[PDB]
Amino acid sequence: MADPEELFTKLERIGKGGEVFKGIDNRTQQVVAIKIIDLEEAEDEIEDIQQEITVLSQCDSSYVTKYYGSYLKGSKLWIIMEYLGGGSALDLLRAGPFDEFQIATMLKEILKGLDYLHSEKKIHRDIKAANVLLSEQGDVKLAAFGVAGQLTDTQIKRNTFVGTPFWMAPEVIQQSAYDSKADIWSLGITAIELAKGEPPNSDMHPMRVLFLIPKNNPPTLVGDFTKSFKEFIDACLNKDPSFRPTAKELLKHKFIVKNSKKTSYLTELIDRFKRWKAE
Amino acid sequence: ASPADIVKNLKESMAVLEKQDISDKKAEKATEEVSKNLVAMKEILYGTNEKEPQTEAVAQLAQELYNSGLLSTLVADLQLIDFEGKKDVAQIFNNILRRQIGTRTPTVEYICTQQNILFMLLKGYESPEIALNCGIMLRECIRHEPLAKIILWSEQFYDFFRYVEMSTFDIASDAFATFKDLLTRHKLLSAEFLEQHYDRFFSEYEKLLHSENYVTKRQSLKLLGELLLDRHNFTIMTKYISKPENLKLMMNLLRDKSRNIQFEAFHVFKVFVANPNKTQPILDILLKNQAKLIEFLSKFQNDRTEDEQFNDEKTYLVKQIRDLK
Numbered sequence: 001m002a003d004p005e006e007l008f009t010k011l012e013r014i015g016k017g018g019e020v021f022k023g024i025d026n027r028t029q030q031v032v033a034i035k036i037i038d039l040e041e042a043e044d045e046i047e048d049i050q051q052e053i054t055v056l057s058q059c060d061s062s063y064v065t066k067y068y069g070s071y072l073k074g075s076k077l078w079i080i081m082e083y084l085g086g087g088s089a090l091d092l093l094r095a096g097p098f099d100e101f102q103i104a105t106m107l108k109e110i111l112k113g114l115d116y117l118h119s120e121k122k123i124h125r126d127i128k129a130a131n132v133l134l135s136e137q138g139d140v141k142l143a144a145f146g147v148a149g150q151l152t153d154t155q156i157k158r159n160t161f162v163g164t165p166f167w168m169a170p171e172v173i174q175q176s177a178y179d180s181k182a183d184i185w186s187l188g189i190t191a192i193e194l195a196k197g198e199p200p201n202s203d204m205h206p207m208r209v210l211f212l213i214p215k216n217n218p219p220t221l222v223g224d225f226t227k228s229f230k231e232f233i234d235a236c237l238n239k240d241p242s243f244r245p246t247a248k249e250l251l252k253h254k255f256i257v258k259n260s261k262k263t264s265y266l267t268e269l270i271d272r273f274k275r276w277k278a279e
Numbered sequence: 280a281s282p283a284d285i286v287k288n289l290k291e292s293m294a295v296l297e298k299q300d301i302s303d304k305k306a307e308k309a310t311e312e313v314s315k316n317l318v319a320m321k322e323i324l325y326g327t328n329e330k331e332p333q334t335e336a337v338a339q340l341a342q343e344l345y346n347s348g349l350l351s352t353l354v355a356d357l358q359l360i361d362f363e364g365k366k367d368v369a370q371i372f373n374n375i376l377r378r379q380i381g382t383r384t385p386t387v388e389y390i391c392t393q394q395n396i397l398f399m400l401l402k403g404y405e406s407p408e409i410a411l412n413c414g415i416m417l418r419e420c421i422r423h424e425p426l427a428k429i430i431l432w433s434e435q436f437y438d439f440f441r442y443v444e445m446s447t448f449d450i451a452s453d454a455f456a457t458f459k460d461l462l463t464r465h466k467l468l469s470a471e472f473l474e475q476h477y478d479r480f481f482s483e484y485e486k487l488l489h490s491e492n493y494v495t496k497r498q499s500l501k502l503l504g505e506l507l508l509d510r511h512n513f514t515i516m517t518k519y520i521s522k523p524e525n526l527k528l529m530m531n532l533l534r535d536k537s538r539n540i541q542f543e544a545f546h547v548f549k550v551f552v553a554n555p556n557k558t559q560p561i562l563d564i565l566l567k568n569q570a571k572l573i574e575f576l577s578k579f580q581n582d583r584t585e586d587e588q589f590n591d592e593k594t595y596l597v598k599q600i601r602d603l604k
């Protein structure tokens with residue numbers, strides 16, 4: 001029933017994070033990202049994969065990538081999603097750094113997405129420059145693949161865990177409780193990344209890092225940056241989860257309000273990248 | 280806003296929905312009041328502004344809902360509603376559901392009236408645009424001990440085997456989810472069913488163990504095992520583990536295309552070959568094959584080690600097989 005191989009055509013390979021594929025809905029000629037999951041391998045049951053799907057279908061924010069259903073071919077399950085043209089924010093970075101204004105514009109958008117998710121008692125659990133995507137016209141939205149309901153543990157045993165601890169909050173690392181306020185902390189780290197091009201301690205060894213995050217003082221923006229940027233970051237990267245603002249509260253923080261510009265003006269970066277990159 | 284805003288809602292905006300052509304009046308404006316007043320619910324029904332779901336506000340509210348079949352023709356048509364409105368309706372249903380007096384809910388007491396409130400939901404499974412919402416609400420009420428007994432015994436219960444075999448995965452998944460949550464949720468209430476409806480049920484269930492569809496085949500085979508070792512279902516298993524029809528089929532699932540499928544069959548296979556009081560049809564078919572089953576169980580997924588309990592059962596099965604008679 002409904003063979004997805006002839007329903008869709010796989011093109012290039014896109015994102016690693018596996019096997020996602022740029023592809024075309026052969027019927028409507030509309031471009032999509034297709035994640036192809038093994039099920040014969042899995043082996044985190046199917047009830048987790050079916051669970052990861054049920055959550056996605058619940059999401060309908062235009063700040064999070066739209067889920068377009070899934071199809072089964074033998075033992076392989078194609079999950080189909082709203083394809084974003086511009087690519088990752090981490091990719092866009094490759095053509096040179098960002099305006100404190102472009103940065104702010106993004107964060108405002110991410111924040112809008114994060115509110116939606118937080119309102120619906122969901123977390124994202126994987127906020128990095130890499131999972132922030134742009135459209136051809138510069139709309140900023142969250143790769144929905146992170147998304148998860150509050151309860152019954154994210155990481156467990158495969159295609160759920162985070163490989164890198166860099167953006168991880170300290171109450172996550174210490175295994176203790178942790179809710180939507182650990183999302184905020186990543187947004188903090190994401191900001192520093194968007195500013196500097198990589199999260200604090202990229203030079204370091206992941207095991208070492210993981211033990212430092214809770215022991216140390218939080219990271220902080222360093223350099224040629226408006227005091228309200230630096231302040232915005234310290235709002236996020238407070239080590240006590242409750243001392244961190246909600247999403248909405250941050251949407252009103254001076255750094256955003258002073259600095260965010262029209263979301264269309266982001267097509268600057270898509271047009272730069274485009275100009276910069278061969279092939 | 281009070282009960283004086285549920286009236287100006289359900290009578291005016293709601294009842295009007297099922298009537299419209301393609302007007303500019305009910306294009307968005309009239310459907311907006313429908314959607315806006317559902318958000319007004321979740322405000323008083325759930326977290327009031329900053330604070331918690333009020334106990335003050337419910338008293339003079341929950342009763343005004345049962346006034347007429349107001350949630351009858353509400354469910355008797357969706358799609359035309361809203362995406363985030365459907366989401367509210369779901370949670371609006373699912374938060375007053377637990378409104379309780381003493382240790383019994385006034386919801387259950389005044390759902391059990393004209394019970395066709397639930398027949399609508401299961402039937403929502405064929406409308407792909409709502410199917411998921413219906414299941415979401417449905418599971419939340421078959422969650423209650425007295426509530427699920429209503430559906431279990433239905434005639435249109437046996438519609439599931441067509442629902443589960445629906446093409447669109449996510450619906451064919453969510454179908455099996457309500458399927459399970461009934462035959463499990465209440466262990467005492469469930470055992471009541473399988474005995475009085477063994478013949479019709481397991482002939483229908485056997486259809487599943489054939490269908491492939493990798494997932495439908497798997498989940499069903501797995502759900503089989505759970506239902507047998509339930510121990511509230513000791514009567515049912517001794518019954519099922521007796522027909523040689525069932526054991527014949529298991530044997531072939533072990534020869535399956537799929538690794539995970541084979542192993543998932545070995546979990547119903549062992550149950551047959553472990554029964555203290557094995558009946559004659561089983562013992563006959565086992566002896567008949569005995570010679571070359573040892574040949575199969577010698578090299579059966581020899582890598583999972585790892586699983587002693589697997590291998591401890593492995594040798595145990597070859598004892599039974601080699602020893603009879």
Ligand SMILES: Nc1nc(Nc2ccc(S(N)(=O)=O)cc2)nn1C(=S)Nc1c(F)cccc1F
Pocket residue numbers: 014015016017020033065081082083084085086087088091133143144145
């Ligand atoms: N929905 C969506 N659209 C896109 N567009 C995209 C992403 C990367 C690139 S790339 N890295 O420039 O080739 C090009 C287009 N990526 N994408 C998703 S789902 N992002 C994603 C993901 F969700 C998981 C792992 C890796 C990823 F890149």
